[PDB]
Protein backbone atom coordinates (compact mmCIF):
# COMPACT_ATOMS: atom_id res chain seq x y z
CA UNK A 1 0.00 0.00 0.00
CA UNK A 2 2.96 2.34 -0.74
CA UNK A 3 4.86 3.37 -3.92
CA UNK A 4 8.43 2.58 -2.76
CA UNK A 5 11.92 2.08 -4.35
CA UNK A 6 12.52 -1.40 -5.87
CA UNK A 7 16.10 -1.48 -4.43
CA UNK A 8 16.59 -4.51 -2.18
CA UNK A 9 13.00 -5.77 -2.52
CA UNK A 10 12.87 -6.65 -6.23
CA UNK A 11 15.32 -6.71 -9.12
CA UNK A 12 14.86 -7.10 -12.91
CA UNK A 13 16.74 -9.71 -14.98
CA UNK A 14 17.13 -7.96 -18.38
CA UNK A 15 5.29 -4.71 -21.44
CA UNK A 16 6.31 -7.48 -19.00
CA UNK A 17 9.90 -8.48 -18.18
CA UNK A 18 11.31 -11.29 -15.94
CA UNK A 19 12.81 -10.54 -12.52
CA UNK A 20 13.59 -11.89 -9.05
CA UNK A 21 12.92 -11.30 -5.34
CA UNK A 22 16.22 -10.42 -3.68
CA UNK A 23 15.94 -12.11 -0.22
CA UNK A 24 14.83 -15.63 -1.29
CA UNK A 25 15.71 -15.58 -5.04
CA UNK A 26 12.01 -16.39 -5.78
CA UNK A 27 11.05 -15.66 -9.40
CA UNK A 28 8.93 -12.67 -10.38
CA UNK A 29 7.09 -11.08 -13.33
CA UNK A 30 7.63 -7.29 -13.47
CA UNK A 31 5.40 -5.08 -15.65
CA UNK A 32 7.39 -1.99 -16.77
CA UNK A 33 5.82 1.45 -17.58
CA UNK A 34 7.10 5.06 -18.09
CA UNK A 35 5.51 7.71 -15.87
CA UNK A 36 5.62 11.51 -15.46
CA UNK A 37 5.53 13.29 -12.02
CA UNK A 38 1.72 13.73 -12.58
CA UNK A 39 1.27 10.00 -13.42
CA UNK A 40 3.40 8.98 -10.39
CA UNK A 41 1.10 11.21 -8.24
CA UNK A 42 -2.05 9.63 -9.80
CA UNK A 43 -0.74 6.13 -8.89
CA UNK A 44 -0.36 7.24 -5.24
CA UNK A 45 -4.11 8.08 -4.98
CA UNK A 46 -5.13 4.90 -6.88
CA UNK A 47 -3.00 2.73 -4.51
CA UNK A 48 -5.07 4.16 -1.59
CA UNK A 49 -8.21 2.99 -3.51
CA UNK A 50 -6.94 -0.63 -3.67
CA UNK A 51 -9.22 -3.26 -2.12
CA UNK A 52 -7.85 -5.94 0.17
CA UNK A 53 -8.21 -9.61 -0.88
CA UNK A 54 -6.23 -12.71 0.19
CA UNK A 55 -3.74 -14.91 -1.81
CA UNK A 56 -5.27 -17.52 -4.19
CA UNK A 57 -4.17 -20.59 -6.13
CA UNK A 58 -6.13 -19.46 -9.24
CA UNK A 59 -4.80 -15.85 -9.14
CA UNK A 60 -1.18 -14.84 -9.81
CA UNK A 61 -0.64 -13.04 -6.47
CA UNK A 62 -0.14 -9.27 -6.75
CA UNK A 63 2.93 -8.05 -4.91
CA UNK A 64 3.10 -4.25 -5.41
CA UNK A 65 3.95 -0.99 -7.23
CA UNK A 66 7.48 0.48 -7.21
CA UNK A 67 9.09 3.56 -8.78
CA UNK A 68 12.57 2.89 -10.23
CA UNK A 69 13.94 6.45 -9.93
CA UNK A 70 15.87 6.72 -13.23
CA UNK A 71 17.00 8.31 -15.51
CA UNK A 72 17.61 11.99 -14.56
CA UNK A 73 15.95 14.24 -17.17
CA UNK A 74 13.88 11.50 -18.90
CA UNK A 75 10.62 9.80 -17.73
CA UNK A 76 10.82 7.58 -14.61
CA UNK A 77 9.88 3.84 -14.60
CA UNK A 78 6.86 2.25 -12.81
CA UNK A 79 7.17 -1.45 -11.90
CA UNK A 80 4.27 -3.78 -11.07
CA UNK A 81 5.31 -7.06 -9.43
CA UNK A 82 3.22 -10.24 -9.60
CA UNK A 83 3.74 -14.03 -9.06
CA UNK A 84 5.80 -15.69 -11.84
CA UNK A 85 4.06 -18.13 -14.22
CA UNK A 86 6.35 -20.22 -16.43
CA UNK A 87 4.38 -22.20 -19.07
CA UNK A 88 2.97 -18.95 -20.58
CA UNK A 89 -0.61 -17.93 -21.48
CA UNK A 90 -3.70 -19.87 -22.68
CA UNK A 91 -3.30 -17.94 -26.00
CA UNK A 92 0.24 -19.37 -26.31
CA UNK A 93 -1.10 -22.86 -25.34
CA UNK A 94 -3.66 -22.74 -28.19
CA UNK A 95 -1.14 -21.27 -30.71
CA UNK A 96 1.31 -24.05 -29.84
CA UNK A 97 -1.42 -26.72 -30.32
CA UNK A 98 -2.05 -29.09 -33.30
CA UNK A 99 -5.31 -27.78 -34.85
CA UNK A 100 -5.30 -24.51 -32.83
CA UNK A 101 -8.18 -25.92 -30.79
CA UNK A 102 -8.26 -27.59 -27.37
CA UNK A 103 -9.92 -30.77 -26.14
CA UNK A 104 -13.40 -30.09 -24.67
CA UNK A 105 -12.17 -31.49 -21.31
CA UNK A 106 -9.17 -29.08 -21.33
CA UNK A 107 -11.59 -26.15 -22.00
CA UNK A 108 -13.91 -27.31 -19.16
CA UNK A 109 -10.84 -27.60 -16.85
CA UNK A 110 -9.43 -24.15 -17.69
CA UNK A 111 -12.88 -22.45 -17.57
CA UNK A 112 -13.55 -23.81 -14.07
CA UNK A 113 -10.11 -22.57 -12.96
CA UNK A 114 -10.95 -19.10 -14.51
CA UNK A 115 -14.36 -19.08 -12.74
CA UNK A 116 -12.76 -20.22 -9.45
CA UNK A 117 -10.38 -17.21 -9.43
CA UNK A 118 -13.18 -14.92 -10.68
CA UNK A 119 -15.43 -16.06 -7.77
CA UNK A 120 -12.56 -15.11 -5.45
CA UNK A 121 -12.38 -11.54 -6.89
CA UNK A 122 -16.19 -11.12 -7.02
CA UNK A 123 -16.85 -11.92 -3.27
CA UNK A 124 -14.19 -9.27 -2.44
CA UNK A 125 -16.10 -6.77 -4.71
CA UNK A 126 -13.34 -6.68 -7.38
CA UNK A 127 -14.04 -6.87 -11.15
CA UNK A 128 -11.20 -8.32 -13.26
CA UNK A 129 -12.08 -6.25 -16.36
CA UNK A 130 -9.74 -8.07 -18.77
CA UNK A 131 -10.44 -11.82 -18.83
CA UNK A 132 -9.05 -13.24 -22.09
CA UNK A 133 -6.69 -16.08 -23.12
CA UNK A 134 -3.62 -13.73 -22.87
CA UNK A 135 -4.36 -13.00 -19.18
CA UNK A 136 -4.73 -16.58 -17.95
CA UNK A 137 -1.31 -18.09 -17.22
CA UNK A 138 0.11 -21.61 -16.59
CA UNK A 139 2.76 -22.24 -13.88
CA UNK A 140 5.74 -24.82 -14.11
CA UNK A 141 3.00 -27.43 -13.25
CA UNK A 142 -0.62 -27.48 -14.63
CA UNK A 143 -1.75 -24.51 -12.43
CA UNK A 144 -4.21 -22.02 -13.97
CA UNK A 145 -3.80 -18.39 -12.70
CA UNK A 146 -5.51 -15.06 -13.54
CA UNK A 147 -3.16 -12.13 -14.36
CA UNK A 148 -3.22 -9.51 -11.54
CA UNK A 149 -1.16 -6.24 -11.49
CA UNK A 150 -3.44 -4.37 -9.07
CA UNK A 151 -6.74 -5.17 -10.82
CA UNK A 152 -8.73 -3.57 -7.96
CA UNK A 153 -7.68 -0.11 -9.11
CA UNK A 154 -6.46 -1.15 -12.66
CA UNK A 155 -2.94 0.14 -11.98
CA UNK A 156 -1.64 -1.26 -15.27
CA UNK A 157 -4.28 0.58 -17.37
CA UNK A 158 -4.71 4.05 -15.81
CA UNK A 159 -1.24 5.44 -16.55
CA UNK A 160 1.23 5.30 -19.49
CA UNK A 161 0.78 6.43 -23.14
CA UNK A 162 -1.60 3.52 -23.84
CA UNK A 163 -4.00 4.43 -20.98
CA UNK A 164 -6.24 6.72 -23.23
CA UNK A 165 -6.42 3.88 -25.78
CA UNK A 166 -9.79 2.15 -26.17
CA UNK A 167 -8.01 -1.22 -26.53
CA UNK A 168 -8.96 -4.58 -28.00
CA UNK A 169 -12.77 -5.06 -28.21
CA UNK A 170 -13.21 -8.75 -28.96
CA UNK A 171 -13.69 -9.91 -25.33
CA UNK A 172 -15.70 -6.84 -24.18
CA UNK A 173 -19.20 -7.66 -22.87
CA UNK A 174 -22.08 -5.67 -24.47
CA UNK A 175 -22.52 -3.41 -21.38
CA UNK A 176 -18.90 -2.13 -21.28
CA UNK A 177 -19.34 -0.71 -24.85
CA UNK A 178 -21.08 2.65 -25.05
CA UNK A 179 -23.62 2.71 -27.90
CA UNK A 180 -27.18 4.10 -28.58
CA UNK A 181 -29.34 2.68 -25.69
CA UNK A 182 -26.13 2.15 -23.59
CA UNK A 183 -24.69 5.66 -22.92
CA UNK A 184 -23.00 4.71 -19.64
CA UNK A 185 -20.40 1.91 -20.04
CA UNK A 186 -21.25 -0.22 -16.99
CA UNK A 187 -18.43 -2.61 -15.92
CA UNK A 188 -20.37 -5.20 -13.82
CA UNK A 189 -18.93 -8.34 -12.13
CA UNK A 190 -21.05 -10.33 -14.68
CA UNK A 191 -18.96 -8.64 -17.46
CA UNK A 192 -16.06 -11.00 -16.59
CA UNK A 193 -18.49 -13.93 -17.13
CA UNK A 194 -19.22 -12.80 -20.74
CA UNK A 195 -15.40 -12.50 -21.20
CA UNK A 196 -15.08 -16.11 -19.85
CA UNK A 197 -17.56 -17.45 -22.43
CA UNK A 198 -15.57 -15.56 -25.16
CA UNK A 199 -12.31 -17.07 -23.75
CA UNK A 200 -13.90 -20.58 -23.97
CA UNK A 201 -14.68 -19.91 -27.70
CA UNK A 202 -11.00 -18.72 -28.10
CA UNK A 203 -9.88 -22.10 -26.63
CA UNK A 204 -12.18 -24.06 -28.94
CA UNK A 205 -11.41 -22.05 -32.15
CA UNK A 206 -7.98 -20.41 -31.61
CA UNK A 207 -9.40 -16.85 -31.82
CA UNK A 208 -12.42 -15.03 -30.30
CA UNK A 209 -15.59 -14.31 -32.36
CA UNK A 210 -15.54 -11.51 -34.98
CA UNK A 211 -11.66 -11.70 -35.16
CA UNK A 212 -11.97 -11.16 -38.96
CA UNK A 213 -13.36 -7.59 -38.49
CA UNK A 214 -11.40 -4.31 -38.02
CA UNK A 215 -11.46 -3.64 -34.23
CA UNK A 216 -13.89 -0.66 -34.70
CA UNK A 217 -16.49 -2.71 -36.69
CA UNK A 218 -16.27 -5.49 -34.04
CA UNK A 219 -16.87 -2.87 -31.26
CA UNK A 220 -20.01 -1.63 -33.11
CA UNK A 221 -21.31 -5.24 -33.62
CA UNK A 222 -20.71 -6.72 -30.10
CA UNK A 223 -23.75 -4.79 -28.62
CA UNK A 224 -25.99 -5.36 -31.70
CA UNK A 225 -25.30 -8.92 -32.94
CA UNK A 226 -27.09 -11.80 -31.14
CA UNK A 227 -24.74 -13.70 -28.76
CA UNK A 228 -21.75 -15.36 -30.46
CA UNK A 229 -21.95 -19.08 -31.14
CA UNK A 230 -19.47 -21.96 -31.64
CA UNK A 231 -18.96 -22.49 -35.38
CA UNK A 232 -18.59 -26.29 -35.15
CA UNK A 233 -21.43 -28.65 -34.33
CA UNK A 234 -19.04 -31.41 -32.98
CA UNK A 235 -19.14 -30.05 -29.35
CA UNK A 236 -21.43 -31.50 -26.69
CA UNK A 237 -24.78 -30.15 -25.51
CA UNK A 238 -22.97 -29.19 -22.25
CA UNK A 239 -20.50 -26.94 -24.09
CA UNK A 240 -23.20 -25.14 -26.10
CA UNK A 241 -25.22 -24.71 -22.91
CA UNK A 242 -22.24 -23.24 -21.04
CA UNK A 243 -21.45 -20.71 -23.85
CA UNK A 244 -25.22 -19.83 -23.98
CA UNK A 245 -25.16 -19.33 -20.18
CA UNK A 246 -22.14 -16.98 -20.30
CA UNK A 247 -23.14 -15.09 -23.41
CA UNK A 248 -26.45 -13.74 -22.22
CA UNK A 249 -26.77 -10.36 -24.02
CA UNK A 250 -28.30 -8.45 -21.07
CA UNK A 251 -26.04 -8.64 -18.00
CA UNK A 252 -29.14 -8.23 -15.75
CA UNK A 253 -30.16 -11.72 -16.96
CA UNK A 254 -26.67 -13.30 -17.07
CA UNK A 255 -25.77 -15.73 -14.22
CA UNK A 256 -23.26 -15.10 -11.43
CA UNK A 257 -19.87 -16.90 -11.07
CA UNK A 258 -21.49 -19.08 -8.39
CA UNK A 259 -24.28 -20.27 -10.75
CA UNK A 260 -21.78 -20.97 -13.60
CA UNK A 261 -19.61 -22.97 -11.19
CA UNK A 262 -22.61 -25.35 -10.74
CA UNK A 263 -23.12 -25.68 -14.60
CA UNK A 264 -22.72 -29.40 -15.65
CA UNK A 265 -19.98 -28.51 -18.19
CA UNK A 266 -17.91 -26.95 -15.37
CA UNK A 267 -19.21 -29.12 -12.47
CA UNK A 268 -18.97 -32.60 -14.10
CA UNK A 269 -15.31 -33.29 -14.91
CA UNK A 270 -14.61 -37.01 -14.23
CA UNK A 271 -11.24 -36.93 -16.04
CA UNK A 272 -10.09 -33.91 -13.96
CA UNK A 273 -6.81 -35.58 -12.79
CA UNK A 274 -6.01 -37.10 -16.20
CA UNK A 275 -6.54 -33.71 -17.96
CA UNK A 276 -4.28 -32.07 -15.32
CA UNK A 277 -1.55 -34.63 -16.27
CA UNK A 278 -1.63 -34.24 -20.10
CA UNK A 279 -1.52 -30.43 -19.56
CA UNK A 280 1.79 -30.71 -17.59
CA UNK A 281 3.00 -33.27 -20.19
CA UNK A 282 2.26 -30.65 -22.94
CA UNK A 283 4.17 -28.00 -20.89
CA UNK A 284 7.17 -30.41 -20.63
CA UNK A 285 7.34 -31.04 -24.41
CA UNK A 286 7.06 -27.29 -25.15
CA UNK A 287 10.02 -26.52 -22.81
CA UNK A 288 12.31 -28.37 -25.29
CA UNK B 1 10.50 -7.62 -51.12
CA UNK B 2 11.60 -8.40 -47.54
CA UNK B 3 14.11 -11.11 -48.61
CA UNK B 4 16.29 -8.50 -50.42
CA UNK B 5 16.79 -6.58 -47.10
CA UNK B 6 20.30 -6.45 -45.60
CA UNK B 7 21.25 -6.72 -41.89
CA UNK B 8 21.75 -3.18 -40.48
CA UNK B 9 24.92 -4.28 -38.55
CA UNK B 10 27.61 -1.81 -39.95
CA UNK B 11 24.96 0.65 -41.21
CA UNK B 12 22.77 1.80 -38.29
CA UNK B 13 22.81 1.70 -34.43
CA UNK B 14 19.88 1.91 -32.03
CA UNK B 15 20.89 4.79 -29.67
CA UNK B 16 17.94 5.62 -27.27
CA UNK B 17 14.13 5.00 -27.32
CA UNK B 18 12.62 8.22 -28.70
CA UNK B 19 9.02 7.17 -29.42
CA UNK B 20 6.33 4.47 -29.11
CA UNK B 21 6.44 -0.46 -33.78
CA UNK B 22 8.88 1.11 -31.26
CA UNK B 23 10.81 4.13 -32.59
CA UNK B 24 14.49 4.49 -31.58
CA UNK B 25 16.87 7.44 -31.96
CA UNK B 26 19.09 5.81 -34.58
CA UNK B 27 22.55 6.68 -35.90
CA UNK B 28 24.21 5.91 -39.22
CA UNK B 29 27.62 4.29 -38.32
CA UNK B 30 29.64 5.61 -41.31
CA UNK B 31 28.73 9.36 -40.89
CA UNK B 32 27.12 9.74 -37.43
CA UNK B 33 23.85 11.12 -38.91
CA UNK B 34 20.71 10.95 -36.76
CA UNK B 35 17.71 8.99 -38.15
CA UNK B 36 14.43 7.64 -36.68
CA UNK B 37 14.45 3.83 -36.68
CA UNK B 38 11.11 2.05 -36.21
CA UNK B 39 11.77 -1.49 -34.98
CA UNK B 40 8.98 -4.08 -35.57
CA UNK B 41 9.14 -7.89 -35.08
CA UNK B 42 8.07 -9.47 -38.39
CA UNK B 43 5.69 -12.38 -37.79
CA UNK B 44 5.86 -14.45 -41.10
CA UNK B 45 2.07 -13.73 -41.65
CA UNK B 46 2.35 -9.86 -41.18
CA UNK B 47 4.83 -9.59 -44.10
CA UNK B 48 1.93 -7.83 -46.00
CA UNK B 49 0.61 -5.22 -43.56
CA UNK B 50 4.17 -4.13 -42.60
CA UNK B 51 5.01 -4.00 -46.35
CA UNK B 52 2.10 -1.60 -47.10
CA UNK B 53 3.49 1.08 -44.72
CA UNK B 54 6.97 0.73 -46.28
CA UNK B 55 5.47 1.19 -49.77
CA UNK B 56 3.60 4.36 -48.68
CA UNK B 57 6.76 5.82 -47.17
CA UNK B 58 9.01 5.03 -50.18
CA UNK B 59 6.21 6.40 -52.45
CA UNK B 60 5.29 9.73 -50.70
CA UNK B 61 7.76 10.62 -47.86
CA UNK B 62 9.97 12.92 -50.03
CA UNK B 63 7.57 15.94 -49.49
CA UNK B 64 8.65 18.92 -47.39
CA UNK B 65 6.16 18.19 -44.55
CA UNK B 66 6.44 14.37 -44.48
CA UNK B 67 9.41 12.77 -42.61
CA UNK B 68 11.55 11.35 -45.45
CA UNK B 69 12.13 7.58 -45.64
CA UNK B 70 15.77 6.45 -45.69
CA UNK B 71 15.64 2.65 -46.02
CA UNK B 72 14.63 -0.69 -44.53
CA UNK B 73 16.73 -3.50 -43.03
CA UNK B 74 16.05 -6.95 -41.52
CA UNK B 75 18.00 -8.27 -38.55
CA UNK B 76 17.53 -12.09 -38.63
CA UNK B 77 16.73 -13.97 -35.38
CA UNK B 78 16.51 -17.65 -34.23
CA UNK B 79 10.86 -13.87 -35.45
CA UNK B 80 13.08 -11.50 -37.48
CA UNK B 81 13.15 -7.72 -36.84
CA UNK B 82 12.36 -5.04 -39.42
CA UNK B 83 14.04 -1.65 -39.18
CA UNK B 84 12.09 1.09 -40.88
CA UNK B 85 14.60 3.93 -41.20
CA UNK B 86 13.46 7.50 -41.82
CA UNK B 87 14.19 11.22 -41.05
CA UNK B 88 14.98 12.35 -37.49
CA UNK B 89 12.87 15.26 -36.26
CA UNK B 90 15.00 16.63 -33.43
CA UNK B 91 12.56 18.94 -31.60
CA UNK B 92 9.89 16.31 -30.84
CA UNK B 93 6.11 16.47 -31.29
CA UNK B 94 3.63 19.36 -31.09
CA UNK B 95 2.12 17.68 -27.96
CA UNK B 96 5.51 17.86 -26.19
CA UNK B 97 5.98 21.49 -27.33
CA UNK B 98 2.61 22.72 -25.85
CA UNK B 99 3.10 20.83 -22.55
CA UNK B 100 6.67 22.20 -22.21
CA UNK B 101 5.18 25.76 -22.29
CA UNK B 102 4.06 28.36 -19.69
CA UNK B 103 0.30 27.95 -19.17
CA UNK B 104 0.37 24.82 -21.44
CA UNK B 105 -0.85 26.72 -24.54
CA UNK B 106 0.47 27.98 -27.92
CA UNK B 107 0.39 31.42 -29.59
CA UNK B 108 -2.12 32.02 -32.38
CA UNK B 109 0.69 32.78 -34.92
CA UNK B 110 2.49 29.49 -34.05
CA UNK B 111 -0.91 27.66 -34.36
CA UNK B 112 -1.38 29.16 -37.83
CA UNK B 113 2.16 28.21 -38.97
CA UNK B 114 1.93 24.56 -37.84
CA UNK B 115 -1.69 24.24 -39.08
CA UNK B 116 -0.68 25.31 -42.62
CA UNK B 117 2.21 22.77 -42.63
CA UNK B 118 -0.13 19.91 -41.49
CA UNK B 119 -2.56 20.96 -44.25
CA UNK B 120 0.39 21.08 -46.73
CA UNK B 121 1.48 17.49 -45.94
CA UNK B 122 -2.17 16.37 -45.95
CA UNK B 123 -2.79 18.04 -49.33
CA UNK B 124 0.07 15.99 -50.82
CA UNK B 125 -1.42 12.70 -49.48
CA UNK B 126 -5.00 13.62 -50.50
CA UNK B 127 -3.73 14.50 -54.06
CA UNK B 128 -2.28 10.93 -54.24
CA UNK B 129 -5.39 9.28 -52.66
CA UNK B 130 -3.91 8.61 -49.19
CA UNK B 131 -5.79 9.36 -45.93
CA UNK B 132 -3.31 9.53 -42.98
CA UNK B 133 -6.16 8.51 -40.58
CA UNK B 134 -4.28 9.38 -37.36
CA UNK B 135 -3.68 13.15 -37.32
CA UNK B 136 -2.85 14.38 -33.80
CA UNK B 137 -0.24 16.33 -31.80
CA UNK B 138 1.76 13.13 -31.33
CA UNK B 139 2.14 12.57 -35.11
CA UNK B 140 3.15 16.14 -36.04
CA UNK B 141 6.85 16.63 -35.38
CA UNK B 142 9.46 19.37 -35.69
CA UNK B 143 13.01 19.23 -37.10
CA UNK B 144 15.93 21.16 -35.49
CA UNK B 145 15.48 23.65 -38.41
CA UNK B 146 11.91 24.27 -36.87
CA UNK B 147 10.23 22.52 -39.84
CA UNK B 148 6.95 20.57 -39.66
CA UNK B 149 6.79 16.84 -40.50
CA UNK B 150 3.97 14.23 -40.39
CA UNK B 151 4.86 10.81 -39.03
CA UNK B 152 3.15 7.35 -38.34
CA UNK B 153 1.46 5.68 -41.31
CA UNK B 154 0.71 2.45 -39.35
CA UNK B 155 -3.03 3.09 -39.56
CA UNK B 156 -3.54 4.08 -43.27
CA UNK B 157 -5.09 -4.04 -36.28
CA UNK B 158 -6.25 -5.46 -32.94
CA UNK B 159 -6.28 -2.45 -30.51
CA UNK B 160 -8.41 0.69 -31.15
CA UNK B 161 -6.25 3.65 -30.09
CA UNK B 162 -7.21 7.04 -28.71
CA UNK B 163 -10.64 8.48 -29.69
CA UNK B 164 -10.17 12.24 -29.13
CA UNK B 165 -8.99 13.14 -32.68
CA UNK B 166 -11.54 10.90 -34.54
CA UNK B 167 -13.98 12.60 -36.89
CA UNK B 168 -17.63 11.61 -36.16
CA UNK B 169 -18.01 9.69 -39.44
CA UNK B 170 -15.18 7.25 -38.55
CA UNK B 171 -17.15 6.03 -35.44
CA UNK B 172 -20.01 3.69 -36.43
CA UNK B 173 -23.55 4.06 -35.01
CA UNK B 174 -27.17 3.12 -36.12
CA UNK B 175 -27.36 5.94 -38.80
CA UNK B 176 -23.72 5.30 -39.85
CA UNK B 177 -23.19 1.45 -39.61
CA UNK B 178 -20.29 1.22 -42.04
CA UNK B 179 -18.34 4.20 -40.52
CA UNK B 180 -18.12 5.90 -43.95
CA UNK B 181 -14.56 7.33 -44.19
CA UNK B 182 -13.41 10.10 -46.56
CA UNK B 183 -10.21 12.21 -46.79
CA UNK B 184 -12.22 14.97 -45.03
CA UNK B 185 -11.87 12.96 -41.74
CA UNK B 186 -8.20 14.15 -41.71
CA UNK B 187 -9.48 17.76 -41.82
CA UNK B 188 -11.50 17.08 -38.60
CA UNK B 189 -8.35 15.70 -36.90
CA UNK B 190 -6.44 18.80 -38.05
CA UNK B 191 -9.07 21.00 -36.30
CA UNK B 192 -8.83 18.89 -33.12
CA UNK B 193 -5.00 19.35 -33.34
CA UNK B 194 -5.39 23.17 -33.70
CA UNK B 195 -7.56 23.08 -30.48
CA UNK B 196 -4.94 20.82 -28.83
CA UNK B 197 -2.31 23.47 -29.59
CA UNK B 198 -4.58 26.34 -28.39
CA UNK B 199 -5.66 24.61 -25.12
CA UNK B 200 -3.01 21.97 -24.35
CA UNK B 201 -5.49 19.04 -24.59
CA UNK B 202 -8.11 17.94 -27.18
CA UNK B 203 -11.86 18.77 -26.81
CA UNK B 204 -12.96 15.79 -24.57
CA UNK B 205 -9.69 15.04 -22.65
CA UNK B 206 -11.35 14.77 -19.17
CA UNK B 207 -13.52 11.78 -20.13
CA UNK B 208 -13.10 8.03 -20.36
CA UNK B 209 -12.16 7.25 -24.00
CA UNK B 210 -15.29 5.04 -24.38
CA UNK B 211 -17.55 7.90 -23.23
CA UNK B 212 -15.61 10.28 -25.61
CA UNK B 213 -16.15 7.76 -28.49
CA UNK B 214 -19.89 7.69 -27.76
CA UNK B 215 -20.10 11.49 -27.44
CA UNK B 216 -18.06 12.60 -30.54
CA UNK B 217 -20.82 11.57 -33.09
CA UNK B 218 -23.59 12.91 -30.82
CA UNK B 219 -22.19 16.27 -29.78
CA UNK B 220 -22.21 19.38 -31.97
CA UNK B 221 -18.73 20.38 -33.26
CA UNK B 222 -16.27 21.29 -30.46
CA UNK B 223 -15.37 24.96 -29.84
CA UNK B 224 -12.52 26.85 -28.08
CA UNK B 225 -12.98 27.71 -24.37
CA UNK B 226 -11.49 31.25 -24.62
CA UNK B 227 -13.02 34.38 -26.28
CA UNK B 228 -9.49 35.88 -26.79
CA UNK B 229 -8.89 34.31 -30.26
CA UNK B 230 -9.47 36.16 -33.52
CA UNK B 231 -12.52 35.72 -35.73
CA UNK B 232 -10.02 34.15 -38.26
CA UNK B 233 -9.07 31.33 -35.79
CA UNK B 234 -12.65 30.49 -34.68
CA UNK B 235 -13.67 30.36 -38.38
CA UNK B 236 -10.74 28.01 -39.15
CA UNK B 237 -11.74 25.68 -36.25
CA UNK B 238 -15.35 25.84 -37.56
CA UNK B 239 -14.11 24.85 -41.05
CA UNK B 240 -12.10 21.84 -39.84
CA UNK B 241 -14.94 20.71 -37.57
CA UNK B 242 -17.96 20.90 -39.95
CA UNK B 243 -20.00 18.15 -38.17
CA UNK B 244 -21.36 16.50 -41.39
CA UNK B 245 -18.32 15.68 -43.64
CA UNK B 246 -20.41 16.16 -46.81
CA UNK B 247 -20.24 19.93 -46.20
CA UNK B 248 -16.71 20.02 -44.66
CA UNK B 249 -14.22 22.07 -46.79
CA UNK B 250 -11.37 20.42 -48.78
CA UNK B 251 -7.66 20.44 -47.92
CA UNK B 252 -7.20 22.98 -50.80
CA UNK B 253 -10.12 25.19 -49.51
CA UNK B 254 -8.67 25.03 -45.98
CA UNK B 255 -5.25 26.20 -47.26
CA UNK B 256 -6.97 29.32 -48.85
CA UNK B 257 -8.76 30.19 -45.54
CA UNK B 258 -7.61 33.58 -44.07
CA UNK B 259 -6.15 32.00 -40.86
CA UNK B 260 -3.87 29.79 -43.03
CA UNK B 261 -3.42 32.07 -46.12
CA UNK B 262 -2.99 35.50 -44.46
CA UNK B 263 0.27 34.86 -42.61
CA UNK B 264 2.43 38.00 -42.36
CA UNK B 265 4.99 36.76 -39.83
CA UNK B 266 5.65 33.56 -41.90
CA UNK B 267 9.47 33.93 -41.71
CA UNK B 268 9.50 35.46 -38.21
CA UNK B 269 7.37 32.88 -36.28
CA UNK B 270 9.93 30.17 -37.17
CA UNK B 271 12.55 32.15 -35.16
CA UNK B 272 10.70 32.04 -31.74
CA UNK B 273 10.26 28.24 -32.06
CA UNK B 274 13.95 27.82 -33.10
CA UNK B 275 14.85 29.60 -29.79
CA UNK B 276 12.50 27.37 -27.65
CA UNK B 277 14.17 24.11 -28.86
CA UNK B 278 17.60 25.52 -27.79
CA UNK B 279 16.50 25.21 -24.11
CA UNK B 280 18.26 22.13 -22.63
C1 LIG C 1 13.31 13.79 -30.93
C2 LIG C 1 12.02 13.09 -30.89
C3 LIG C 1 11.21 12.99 -29.78
N1 LIG C 1 10.13 12.27 -30.18
C4 LIG C 1 9.00 11.92 -29.34
N2 LIG C 1 10.19 11.88 -31.46
C5 LIG C 1 11.35 12.38 -31.92
N3 LIG C 1 11.88 12.24 -33.17
C6 LIG C 1 11.30 11.56 -34.27
C7 LIG C 1 10.37 10.54 -34.08
C8 LIG C 1 9.80 9.88 -35.19
C9 LIG C 1 8.84 8.87 -35.04
C10 LIG C 1 8.30 8.31 -36.19
C11 LIG C 1 7.27 7.30 -36.22
C12 LIG C 1 7.07 6.30 -37.15
N4 LIG C 1 5.96 5.55 -36.86
C13 LIG C 1 5.47 6.09 -35.76
N5 LIG C 1 6.22 7.16 -35.35
C14 LIG C 1 5.92 7.97 -34.18
N6 LIG C 1 8.67 8.67 -37.44
C15 LIG C 1 9.60 9.63 -37.58
N7 LIG C 1 9.96 9.99 -38.88
C16 LIG C 1 10.18 10.28 -36.48
C17 LIG C 1 11.11 11.32 -36.56
N8 LIG C 1 11.67 11.95 -35.50
From Swiss-Prot, chain A:
The active site is at residue 130. It comes from the Eukaryota. ATP binds at residue 31. Residues 10-266 form the Protein kinase domain. It is found in: Cytoplasm. Widely expressed. Isoform 5 is abundant in the brain. Isoform 4 is predominant in the liver, skeletal muscle and placenta. Serine/threonine kinase that plays a role in the response to environmental stress and cytokines such as TNF-alpha. Appears to act upstream of the JUN N-terminal pathway. Activator of the Hippo signaling pathway which plays a pivotal role in organ size control and tumor suppression by restricting proliferation and promoting apoptosis. MAP4Ks act in parallel to and are partially redundant with STK3/MST2 and STK4/MST2 in the phosphorylation and activation of LATS1/2, and establish MAP4Ks as components of the expanded Hippo pathway. Interacts with the SH3 domain of the adapter proteins Nck. Interacts (via its CNH regulatory domain) with ATL1 (via the N-terminal region). Interacts with RAP2A (GTP-bound form preferentially). Belongs to the protein kinase superfamily. STE Ser/Thr protein kinase family. STE20 subfamily. This is Mitogen-activated protein kinase kinase kinase kinase 4. It comes from Homo sapiens. The gene is MAP4K4. The chain holds residues 16 to 311 of 1239 of the full protein.
